[PDB]
Amino acid sequence: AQTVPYGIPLIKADKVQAQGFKGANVKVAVLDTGIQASHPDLNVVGGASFVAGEAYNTDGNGHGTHVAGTVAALDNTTGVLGVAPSVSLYAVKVLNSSGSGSYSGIVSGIEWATTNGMDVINMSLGGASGSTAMKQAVDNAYARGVVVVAAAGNSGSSGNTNTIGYPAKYDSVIAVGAVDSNSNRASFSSVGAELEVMAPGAGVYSTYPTNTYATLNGTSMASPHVAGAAALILSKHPNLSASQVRNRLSSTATYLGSSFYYGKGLINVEAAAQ
């Protein structure tokens, strides 16, 4: 009863998995509303919580479980299939049950990920202005070899206005926009010079609490595809640096139009993991 979401063959993650590279031994931190660790299609092996009275391995919202399942839903006979199903998945709870998080909470999560040897940080979240503490946290993670990925934002387009949010707008972070099953830009996908790559973000079917599945839209859904793609590359070529993995993802992306709207284009993990 396993369903393959359209995004896994669209980014050509199925081709890399067919080679035998599934993210094994790669540590991916999902900085979000936590993850329902008891979900039969997910395997959470650690993490931390920077939210009040919530454990890292629970998700009272659902967003974090959905994002995690796009990266890591298990290759079995149930539910869905993640981009990198064999990754070492870590739940870093930085957003509360209502989805809200503070800059200091995000900073605490990024620093945890850097100190605990994470290979990839996924941040399906955004703020309008950023901070010196937040810039410092993402710059240090990337300088210390972490591939840092974030949702570009869901602020759409208005003339030539740059609508990329933070942390995606920082140069040390991969800003991920959203395309649909036809590789067409989702109208809500943020635009600007920092838009780096696109990934599926419309009608993304993934894991959801409690022990179920849901279809969601957002650059939040696009971002874990690129996080998972980074893990596939690293499971095949573990000695590549974070900038080398990042440059493979942007260099081999399928051109879809103007970089203002699409960045380098839709990621192609088959070409990126060559």
């Binding site: 979000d32 509303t33 919202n61 967003h63 959905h66 930085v94 957003l95 209502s98 989805g99 809200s100 998080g101 503070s102 800059y103 200091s104 909470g105 995000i106 399906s124 979240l125 955004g126 703020g127 309008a128 202005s129 901070s131 949702a151 934002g153 869901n154 602020s155 949010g165 989702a186 809500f188 969601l216 839209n217 957002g218 650059t219 939040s220 859904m221 971002s223």
Partner: protein
Amino acid sequence: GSAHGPSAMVFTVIQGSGEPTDTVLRATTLSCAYTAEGTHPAPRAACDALNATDGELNRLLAAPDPSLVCPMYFDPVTVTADGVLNGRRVAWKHTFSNTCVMSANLNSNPVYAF
């Protein structure tokens, strides 16, 4: 600057992008004349904020909370403003990606504190 003249407005919060069939979540009325009136719970603060926009309601989104982040899932919520704004007819709307983003961007602005 600040605007002058009377105001008679209806503010709503709707589920969606601003389509006419979109479900109303909440609505209120506001009158700004000799005194601040309407069903708005804080009429004087709501009128004061309105007049301060100088006829440009996009200025209600100019003070977002600088310390908050939101999950980037798209489930649109729209704020609307219709009526007379300082003697001028207005039909204004703003769509937020989700309710977290609305809350953070509006940052307890008196106009949408209803």
